């Protein structure tokens, strides 16, 4: 979404799939990550897809 | 100071072990910083300078 208006520096919101209380029942989760810990994934420019 | 109010979110990642992330931030977003008194820093730096 971006904030874009200045006077602010913020923390990016990301999501991933997890090995839950059952091993083979992968479910959805979300987490806030500080920007340096996250990088763009691939030259295939899907901007929503990021890498730890 | 870190004026943001981060909240820790517990995630369960594999059998019998958990991962802790950051959930929603309470309140407004602010910048992290460190403060020093500049007259005392200037005097200290000049004292280094004469040495």
């Amino acid at each position, epitope marked *: 979404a971006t*904030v874009k*208006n*200045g*006077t*602010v520096e*913020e923390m990016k919101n990301c999501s991933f799939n997890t090995t839950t209380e059952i091993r083979d029942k992968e479910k959805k989760e979300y987490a806030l990550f500080y920007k340096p810990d996250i990088v763009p994934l691939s030259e295939t420019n899907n901007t929503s897809e990021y890498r730890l | *100071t870190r*004026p943001n*109010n981060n909240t820790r979110k517990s995630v369960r990642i594999g059998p019998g072990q958990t991962f802790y992330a950051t959930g929603d931030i*309470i*309140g*407004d*977003i*602010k*910048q992290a*910083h460190c403060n020093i008194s500049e007259e005392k820093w200037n005097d200290t730096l000049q004292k280094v300078g004469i040495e």
Partner: antibody
Amino acid sequence: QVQLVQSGAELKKPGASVKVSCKASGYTLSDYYVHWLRQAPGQGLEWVAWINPTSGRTISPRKFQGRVTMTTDTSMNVAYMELRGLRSDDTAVYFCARGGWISLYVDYSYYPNFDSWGQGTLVSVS
Amino acid sequence: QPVLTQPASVSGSPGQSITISCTGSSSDVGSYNLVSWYQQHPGKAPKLMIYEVNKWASGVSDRFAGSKSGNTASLTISRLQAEDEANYFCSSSTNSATVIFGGGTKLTVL
């Protein structure tokens, strides 16, 4: 000199929507957080939301989440607050008010130190 | 989420003292000392009379006390004159990052 002149009143059908605007005067809106408040006839003052007019970041307690959407146009120097899905309760006097100074290093968004208030505008329902 | 409370209506005596209080939870009134008091006349808008318990708002006469204790606070008004006939609201901020108002109480004649 300070004024927070709001727009006029306007009756709406229940379940309708209404845009309410709040005009700055004597100061630039980017200084302070804008708090939105209300007063129904015979009831007390009800706190609705704040907006950080620069980043447009907002918080509203529980009752108005989904109900209220927020914008500002600091070039025009005006603050807006929309309601959707109205009810009979919305027969009430909305007040716009400026809160604390916006500091980059200390969070003053969320505490009750309202300095000046709008005159008052009424959403109404039948 | 609004929870803050206070006696809905009381009366004073000229020249004497009165207690106008408000109460909440440790989450909102004790966790933060950030408390304030407001005066609104019908047909007009409010007017900041206290902020942060005992910082002096503009135009406030020394009658208007400001104190806090635990989950409580009050305008322990002293010398209690008559030219303030409208209500005296309370307010505080929750640790959930929201502002809360009281239900209002009238400084009745008096």
